[PDB]
């Protein structure tokens, strides 16, 4: 017997780290612990997993928060992950957020809608339309907790046409400065994320009727209750690049962006490899370090390190 949530996960040869971050996302864990999911399980979803990812996850979370264990061996959950994502490494969180969403998608028969560009209409109008269109096909606890909206501006270099769309997201991938810096504030990576970038991956200009190396500019339009922030430290083998070990200084308290204020609730760490997690336990407010089966107390001063990989932020 142990304090609920203070529960490790055995190594079975990113998965445990990602589970510990999601486990310590309070509105997600409360949804499962309060048995809100059984009536929303979606068994027919063409994009889902027959309900099996959300079922397996819910049973794991119930174990980790039962208080009966100091650690569990998540073989049943790993089995469902292997069944629907045999490719499993650092992309597992994206797979899980998408899989949980579709297994719990309240839209059982999805309409097809032809999405449209702004076509010079005001941002507010196009964004509301984009979000309404998103919710016509995607309505779940995962949308409620994690989904936000980008403004995307594409500019064709040849004809100078501007195409604006509003596009949903369920996490952010932030670039780090290149060439490599020893220290950067998270706010600087956010500014880099919203900086114009010429595409390398061209974009089809409907005016030129060619694919063009347009420039793409992202803006954060709407932000979710829980913002998942991935720091892009790695690269494919072909680039032959050392992992960026910049010290990214991220707020523990009061990250401000786009008018919302966020507090850190979990961090996935990567050691160049092996993954661990810091998380704030919702019932005692303290920070803990999760290294597979081992759980130990942590201090806030330990959290910002060069190993930080994914940050979980909850809106104040």
């Amino acid at each position: 017997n142990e304090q609920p949530g203070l529960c490790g996960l055995s190594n079975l040869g990113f998965m445990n780290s990602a589970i510990q971050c999601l486990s310590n996302t309070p509105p997600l864990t409360e949804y499962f612990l309060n048995d809100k999911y059984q009536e929303e399980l979606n068994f027919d979803n063409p994009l889902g997993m027959r309900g099996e990812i959300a079922k397996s996850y819910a049973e794991l979370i119930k174990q980790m928060w039962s208080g009966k264990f100091s650690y569990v061996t998540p073989r049943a959950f790993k089995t469902q992950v292997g069944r629907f994502a045999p490719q499993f490494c650092q992309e597992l969180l994206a797979f899980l957020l998408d899989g949980l969403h579709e297994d719990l998608n309240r839209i059982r028969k999805k309409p097809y809608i032809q999405l449209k560009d702004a076509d010079g209409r005001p941002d507010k109008v196009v964004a509301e339309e984009a979000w309404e269109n998103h919710l016509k096909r995607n309505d779940s606890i995962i949308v409620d907790i994690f989904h936000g909206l980008f403004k995307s501006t594409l500019v064709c270099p040849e004809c100078a046409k501007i195409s604006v769309t509003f596009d949903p997201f369920c996490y952010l991938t932030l670039p780090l400065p290149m060439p490599k810096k020893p220290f950067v504030k998270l706010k600087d990576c956010i500014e880099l994320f919203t900086t114009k970038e010429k595409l390398g991956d061209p974009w089809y200009c409907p005016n030129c009727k060619e694919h063009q190396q347009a420039t793409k500019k992202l803006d954060l339009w709407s932000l979710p209750p829980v913002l998942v922030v991935h720091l892009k430290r790695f690269s494919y083998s072909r680039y032959m690049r050392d992992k960026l070990d910049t010290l990214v200084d991220f707020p523990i308290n009061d990250l401000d962006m786009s008018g919302c204020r966020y507090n850190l609730i979990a961090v996935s760490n990567h050691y160049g490899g092996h993954y661990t997690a810091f998380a704030k336990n919702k019932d005692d407010g303290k920070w803990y370090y999760f290294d597979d089966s081992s759980v130990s107390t942590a201090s806030e001063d330990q959290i910002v390190s060069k190993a930080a990989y994914v940050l979980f932020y909850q809106r104040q």
């Binding site: 063409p46 994009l47 998408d98 369920c170 952010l172």
Partner: protein, 87 residues
């Protein structure tokens, strides 16, 4: 309502297809066979859309483009599987 989509090979080549949202993935592979001669059983189609929203999906036969919310001028990723090697 017919729409223009593109299929990009690992070569970087874009294949332009005229499709209907109701078209099945099998119909899309058939159209790819017409343009490029690759047999459908050797085709793997991935739809990533724009990345940070949905996890990339292997398009499954029996599903329709509608199921994946494929839009006009969306781009599908084509992987040809020949003799156990991807091309």
């Amino acid at each position: 309502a017919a729409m223009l989509i593109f299929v990009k090979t690992l070569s970087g080549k874009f294949i332009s297809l005229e499709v209907e949202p109701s078209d099945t993935i099998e119909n899309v592979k058939a159209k790819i066979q017409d343009k490029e001669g690759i047999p459908p059983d050797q085709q793997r189609l991935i739809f990533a859309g724009k990345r940070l929203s949905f996890y990339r999906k292997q398009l499954e036969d029996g599903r329709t483009l509608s199921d994946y919310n494929i839009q006009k001028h969306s781009t599908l990723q084509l992987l040809v599987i020949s003799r156990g090697i991807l091309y």
